[PDB]
Design a protein around this motif. Structure first.
Motif, short mmCIF file in Angstrom:
data_model
loop_
_atom_site.label_atom_id
_atom_site.label_comp_id
_atom_site.label_asym_id
_atom_site.label_seq_id
_atom_site.Cartn_x
_atom_site.Cartn_y
_atom_site.Cartn_z
N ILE A 23 0.86 -1.19 0.00
CA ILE A 23 0.00 0.00 0.00
C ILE A 23 0.89 1.24 0.00
O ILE A 23 0.60 2.24 -0.64
N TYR A 27 0.66 4.36 -2.83
CA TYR A 27 0.24 5.72 -2.51
C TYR A 27 1.35 6.70 -2.21
O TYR A 27 1.14 7.91 -2.25
N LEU A 36 -7.73 6.06 5.88
CA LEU A 36 -8.06 4.63 5.93
C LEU A 36 -9.36 4.60 6.68
O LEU A 36 -9.45 5.15 7.78
N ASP A 83 -7.16 10.48 -0.90
CA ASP A 83 -7.05 9.06 -1.26
C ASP A 83 -7.73 8.31 -0.13
O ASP A 83 -7.45 8.55 1.05
N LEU A 85 -8.86 4.52 1.45
CA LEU A 85 -8.72 3.08 1.43
C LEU A 85 -9.66 2.48 2.47
O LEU A 85 -9.45 2.67 3.67
N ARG A 101 -19.12 1.79 -0.84
CA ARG A 101 -18.25 2.37 -1.86
C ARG A 101 -19.04 3.45 -2.64
O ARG A 101 -18.54 4.56 -2.87
N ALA A 113 -10.25 2.77 -2.90
CA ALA A 113 -9.89 1.37 -3.04
C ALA A 113 -10.34 0.60 -1.81
O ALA A 113 -10.73 1.17 -0.79
N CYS A 115 -9.22 -2.82 0.76
CA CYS A 115 -8.21 -3.77 1.21
C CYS A 115 -8.97 -4.63 2.24
O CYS A 115 -9.54 -4.09 3.19
N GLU A 131 -8.88 -4.00 -4.45
CA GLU A 131 -7.47 -3.88 -4.79
C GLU A 131 -6.47 -4.74 -3.99
O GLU A 131 -5.52 -5.26 -4.55
#
Ligand SMILES: [Mg+2]
Length: 163
Positions: A23, A27, A36, A83, A85, A101, A113, A115, A131
């Protein structure tokens, strides 16, 4: 019933350190702020371990979801232009995750994304993009590492199989 170790604590740890390097590489050069986002309650343990292995500056936030998918508790942070995650413990059906999402998508984050520590592809009812995956598993009755079975085992340091 009984519980046996399926994925030992030390394997989860080694795998998380790899997800973390991975990760971080993905990024590292974005420069934008990163967030996150975990889905409570399942993701708290994975999030704790994963975020410590992500060598990119970021905030950690949580949300609670759960017929329509509703927000029982929204994010405290704003994600527009950031960004993002999403951090899941296990994906099977993928229903809730895909709605989450979409909900977050409306906030226009720079990127989005997912995880998940565990992936159960054979149970997918909707197809949502993922991802990063820690471990891909058969459709086993698993517990531990944040995953409970009727309010217990949630605190086990390993992923176990209910027998
Ligand atoms: Mg979950």
């Amino acid at each position: 019933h009984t519980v046996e170790v399926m994925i030992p604590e030390a394997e989860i740890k080694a795998r998380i350190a790899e997800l973390g390097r991975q990760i971080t590489e993905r990024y590292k050069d974005s420069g934008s702020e990163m967030v996150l986002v975990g889905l409570l309650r399942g993701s708290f343990m994975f999030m704790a371990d994963l975020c410590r292995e992500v060598q990119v500056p970021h905030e950690v936030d949580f949300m609670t979801a759960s017929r329509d998918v509703k927000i029982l508790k929204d994010l405290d942070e704003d994600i527009r232009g950031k960004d993002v995650l999403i951090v899941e413990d296990i994906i099977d059906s993928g229903n809730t995750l895909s709605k989450v999402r979409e909900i977050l998508g409306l906030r226009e984050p720079k990127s989005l994304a997912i995880c998940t520590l565990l992936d159960k592809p054979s149970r997918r009812e909707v197809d949502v993009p993922v991802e990063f995956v820690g471990f891909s598993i058969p459709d086993e009755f698993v517990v531990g590492y944040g995953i409970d079975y009727a309010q217990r085992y949630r605190h086990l340091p390993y992923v176990g199989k209910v027998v």
